[PDB]
Write a protein that binds this DNA or RNA. Sequence first.
RNA 1: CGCCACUUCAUGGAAAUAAAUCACUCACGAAU
Length: 150
Amino acid sequence: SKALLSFNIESINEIVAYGGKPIFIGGDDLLCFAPVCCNGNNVFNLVEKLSTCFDQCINQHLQQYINACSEAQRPLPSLSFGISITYHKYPMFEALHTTDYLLEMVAKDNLFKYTLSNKNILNENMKRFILKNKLAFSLQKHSGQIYHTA
RNA sequence: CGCCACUUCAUGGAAAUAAAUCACUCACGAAU
Ligand SMILES: [Mn+2]
């Protein structure tokens, strides 16, 4: 709880420093509106800074857990990011749908899990192959050309 | 001293070799 609190506060600070407007930062969840570029920093610099804030807060508060568990064998807590860049004259609802798709289906690999679970194939060995710690990024121009990558 | 001519008329080697084989810019823009 302490680590997530510190991360939330520093995330609001860093987002407003970059030039972005926070919408909801609490618990383990984040949503923000940021420019493509602002004063020599691009959006991916902001994403990297938020990721580093997450690792820094996890280090500061969960030092016992990292020092005792993750070194033997355990994945550290992680943060997954979904970024969508669109024209200003674009439907907000569809932009948020795209961001949700990128975060859940792609960045969290919930497409794998959902296709497997809808048909009831989700064995434990197949659950071992679920992937996290991903950056899902998409850009829609004024035309319709999409640049997406993970 | 006099007298006097015939013969031979291109073979062998080298017959192309190397460097560059597309480069840069624009890869959609504006209105809707
Ligand atoms: Mn959550």
